[PDB]
Design a protein around this ligand. Sequence first.
Ligand code: HEM
Ligand SMILES: *[C@@H]1O[C@H](CO)[C@@H](O[C@@H]2O[C@H](CO)[C@@H](O)[C@H](O)[C@H]2NC(C)=O)[C@H](O)[C@H]1NC(C)=O
Ligand SMILES: *[C@H]1O[C@H](CO)[C@@H](O)[C@H](O)[C@@H]1O
Ligand SMILES: [Ca+2]
Ligand SMILES: [Ca+2]
Length: 357
Amino acid sequence: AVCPDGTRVSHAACCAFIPLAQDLQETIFQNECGEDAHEVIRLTFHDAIAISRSQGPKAGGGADGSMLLFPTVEPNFSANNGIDDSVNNLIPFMQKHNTISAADLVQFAGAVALSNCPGAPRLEFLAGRPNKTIAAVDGLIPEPQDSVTKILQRFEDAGGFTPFEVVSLLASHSVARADKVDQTIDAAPFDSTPFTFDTQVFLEVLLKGVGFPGSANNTGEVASPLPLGSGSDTGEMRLQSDFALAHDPRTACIWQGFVNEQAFMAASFRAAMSKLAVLGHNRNSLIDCSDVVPVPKPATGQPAMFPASTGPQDLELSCPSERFPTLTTQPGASQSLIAHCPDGSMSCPGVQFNGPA
Ligand code: HEM
Ligand SMILES: *[C@@H]1O[C@H](CO)[C@@H](O[C@@H]2O[C@H](CO)[C@@H](O)[C@H](O)[C@H]2NC(C)=O)[C@H](O)[C@H]1NC(C)=O
Ligand SMILES: *[C@H]1O[C@H](CO)[C@@H](O)[C@H](O)[C@@H]1O
Ligand SMILES: [Ca+2]
Ligand SMILES: [Ca+2]
């Protein structure tokens, strides 16, 4: 089909996603892997994962736009703290781009957001999810204080995800920060490169923790290897769940296996996201609109490296059967600040709409 803008695409039903991508980029992401992009990526997961094989369809419909269509229900669950901003940012697009279901909007917006993160894959994007659903029930969203048994079971019950697929999906913590875990600090990144879809999170969670970016007593948090912050440049935070996954016998080798393995990580993330994005649907009933996902920014191709103030002597290794790679260390005696903005500048406020969530 040829779309009104002249773009030739696979299927006529994919045309409306072209102006949606442009609007999302111009309005909320600015082609950056920044605050608003991160928030949308998280929303893609919280929308999709609220489904349960065991509980049946009344517990939730998966990747169904329930977050947008019932903005006063799930976003107010404690496990969804902070999801409100992303919901409020996407509702105006749902209202304007009113040929595209809320469910499809969520998944597409995440694909567009991810495309702004150097190294990310170009997600598969299938379209045609209905615009009607139910609000999900509480308890379906993994929380950082949860055990590996509980996490793995939650993902198995949501969609048959394997441990490999779970850890693959956690590549998203390469482009992720926390506002709610610690009340006293904002935007605490989970790796030293929160604007770059690289393997640094996998490396950095394996380092010995030496302090906290904020306070020491938060649920779901453990000591960080890079806790130094100053001004807007908050120190790295470590989630208990990521730590636990990195060390548990079920997942330690998978976790380590992504260190310095960018292409492997990105491909594995793509495959798991292909499954996540269609929870609640038969994929054989959705049309393939992958060709209207923007082309992602490429990695530079550089290997993972130990951040300054860390090195191999700081590793806490847990995979007996796989050799930990040889990596360089960035020079310097003390920790570098992790920039708050994609350009290293002093100001980069994200666009935010008010709304019902
Ligand atoms: C065991 C599973 C997981 C747990 C326990 C978990 C937990 C968390 C927590 C606690 C935060 C910080 C929220 C805040 O305080 O502001 C966060 C952020 C984030 N998570 Fe996860 N997460 C998990 C899986 C995922 C997956 C599967 C994805 C997507 C594929 C995802 C994407 C993100 C993103 C992009 C952010 C950053 C949001 C921002 O910077 O605004 N997470 N996660
Ligand atoms: C999907 O459902 C939503 C929610 O009902 C629809 O949103 C409405 O969109 C119209 C414009 O078409 C606006 O006038 C309303 O204000 C919106 N309602 C709400 C509650 O925000 C949306 O149009 C539907 N989309 C599709 C593809 O059917
Ligand atoms: C980042 O900053 C630290 C200092 O805070 C250095 O040690 C490192 O070399 C890099 O310049
Ligand atoms: Ca949902
Ligand atoms: Ca990163």
